[PDB]
């Protein structure tokens, strides 16, 4: 599921800014 | 047409109300950009009690004013690590900005000051957390509540561009929740003062507009490109663009395609695909009826816009709130005593904080 790749992605925490 | 006689009248008195609100505002501002307040506390007046959140330039403390009894927060900056970090500019420039805005979803800076080794910014508390926080935990949020939020940041930006304020920081990480449940915006490192273009590739990954991505001359409508991607991870509970790596994040925002859960309704599809356009000659917030084409939008129809600038909207989330002082939706961080040497260092750059 769409929900199940997000978990895959590794970015569920909190993000960075390019900075 | 749409509106028969009487509601058409009524929205578009209201737009000129907002015109003339914006004017003032403006006038307002320019008064404070130039003549800044500076130096209107000292580090002796706070009890420091506990650490809210860490950057790589210092830190935000929860911080008790000692005469007062109020609780605060404070940004304390180490002056060698944001020159280290290539931050003067950016640093200048937030308190510049928290100093001259006035909105009620912006941060009140309530005192500055510096000494030999940091600098000091004072804001509001504001404990109820990062949305952050409370989406992850309650996985996403309904349309209503989304709407709530996203209206506040529709009536932010439409403050902060009728400035020529460019955000370019927007999401859920950055966004607060007070004690009645309205948003608080706090960054402004980002933030650009800028009529027409400006060039930096600055912000969060999925949030970037492709026009940042792409290296082009940009406007404020990446800010509107970053309320469509957090209206959907507000309402989805993720966020439109995701890949393992930041790179596959840009080719997916620059593809003009996006797909959304079956539970969102036909009205949302429709905002966010003008919102996450592409193309910049069609995104809303970019066309000739500029926030109208947004404020006007079906899924805004049930939201009162005066109601919600007057925060006379009852929140659908009030955070806990266990008193003054309450940390509890913040996370937990190392305590780091903060020192100030016996030297001064690098008292030149920061003369104007
Ligand atoms: C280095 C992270 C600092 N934070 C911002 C997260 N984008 S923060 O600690 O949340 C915070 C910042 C500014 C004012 C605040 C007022 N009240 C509570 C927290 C506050």
Redesign the interface.
């Known amino acids: 599921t ?2 199940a ?2 978990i ?5 925490g ?6 | 047409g749409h509106m028969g006689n009487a509601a058409a009248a009524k929205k578009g008195s209201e737009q000129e109300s907002v015109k003339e609100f914006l004017a003032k505002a403006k006038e307002e501002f320019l008064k404070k950009w130039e003549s800044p307040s500076q130096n209107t506390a000292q580090l002796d007046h706070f009890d420091r009690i506990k650490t809210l959140g860490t950057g790589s330039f210092g830190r935000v403390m929860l911080v008790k004013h000692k005469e007062t009894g109020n609780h605060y927060a404070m940004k304390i900056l180490d002056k060698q690590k944001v020159v280290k970090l290539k931050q003067i500019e950016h640093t200048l420039n937030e308190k510049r900005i928290l100093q001259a805005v006035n909105f009620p979803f912006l941060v009140k800076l309530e005192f500055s000051f510096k000494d030999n080794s940091n600098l000091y910014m004072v804001m509001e508390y504001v404990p109820g957390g990062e949305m ?1 926080s409370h989406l ?1 935990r309650i996985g996403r949020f309904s349309e209503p509540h989304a709407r709530f939020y996203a209206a506040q940041i529709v009536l932010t930006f439409e403050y902060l561009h009728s400035l020529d304020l460019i955000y370019r ?1 927007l ?1 859920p ?1 950055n966004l607060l929740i007070d004690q009645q449940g309205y948003i608080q915006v706090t960054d402004f490192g ?1 933030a650009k003062r800028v009529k027409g273009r400006t060039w930096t ?6 949030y970037l507009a492709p026009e940042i991505i792409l290296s082009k001359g940009y406007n404020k409508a990446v800010d509107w490109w970053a309320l469509g991607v957090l209206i959907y991870e507000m309402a989805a ?2 966020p439109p663009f ?3 790596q930041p790179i596959q994040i840009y080719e997916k925002i620059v593809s003009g395609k996006v ?1 959304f ?1 079956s539970h969102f309704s036909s009205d949302l599809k429709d905002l966010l695909r003008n919102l996450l356009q592409v193309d910049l000659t069609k995104r809303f917030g970019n066309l000739k009826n500029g926030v109208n084409d947004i404020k006007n939008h079906k899924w805004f129809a049930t939201t009162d816009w005066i109601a919600i600038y007057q925060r006379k909207v009852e929140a659908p989330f009030i955070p806990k709130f266990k008193g003054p002082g309450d940390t509890s939706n913040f996370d937990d961080y190392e305590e780091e005593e903060i020192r100030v040497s016996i030297n001064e260092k690098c008292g030149k750059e920061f003369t104007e904080f």
Do not use: M, Q, W
């Open positions: 769409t929900y790749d997000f895959a992605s590794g970015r569920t909190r993000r960075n800014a390019i900075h | 952050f992850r920081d999401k990480e980002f590739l600055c912000g969060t990954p999925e509970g993720y995701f890949a393992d797909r859960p």
